[PDB]
Design a protein around this nucleic acid. Structure first.
Lengths: 17, 134
RNA sequence: GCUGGGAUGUUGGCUUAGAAGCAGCCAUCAUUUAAAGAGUGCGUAACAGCUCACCAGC
């Protein structure tokens, strides 16, 4: 529901590194 | 523990390797550099990676030889398997060739005798759409 | 019913945003095994974590 990097659509996914 | 198959030379997209390993506290950024550093020698090949993660946010990975399914495809001379195995024949393999692949994947086979190693290969062959010729 | 196995040869050919049993069609293999599903299922956006089949004891 509210993660970072982690699925194909809803809304987050990843983004650091 | 977790096991998977990553492409030698490229590891970083969030969608595939991101969540799968991230859900176990695996440092994606440290994993990608490590995997892309060792497996650089065989860049372009698809291989299985065994990553052992523990309570500590650290891990270790082990490389393995390519799967039999991949070997059989390259041996028969095909890039894609058969949609319907015993329905559409695509490639064929000879007895002596079965021994060759069996001998190569013998150290990672669960078979004891060579005859048992040959048959396990034949099993995958018929289930992949490859005719066995003697 | 209870205590613990329930992986290996692979993420079977693979397709979607992703596919890595639980979407999708034939397949459905063989190990070795004490005995062990190319698997009945919940679940995440999937994985997972987990569930029985079977087993060893009871």
């Amino acid at each position: 529901i509210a993660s970072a990097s982690c699925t194909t659509x809803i809304c987050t996914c990843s983004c650091s590194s | 523990q977790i096991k998977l198959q990553l492409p030698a030379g490229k590891a970083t997209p969030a969608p595939p390797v991101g969540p799968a390993l991230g859900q176990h506290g695996v440092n994606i950024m440290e994993f990608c550099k490590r995997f892309n550093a060792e497996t650089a020698d065989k860049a372009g090949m698809i291989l299985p990676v065994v990553i052992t993660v523990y309570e500590d946010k650290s891990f270790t990975f082990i490389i393995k030889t390519p799967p039999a399914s991949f070997l059989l495809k390259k041996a028969a001379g095909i890039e894609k398997g058969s949609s319907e195995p015993k329905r559409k024949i695509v490639g064929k393999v000879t007895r002596k060739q079965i021994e060759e692949i069996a001998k190569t994947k013998m150290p990672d086979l669960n078979a004891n005798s060579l005859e048992a190693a040959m048959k396990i290969i034949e099993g995958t062959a018929k289930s992949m759409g490859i005719e066995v010729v003697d």
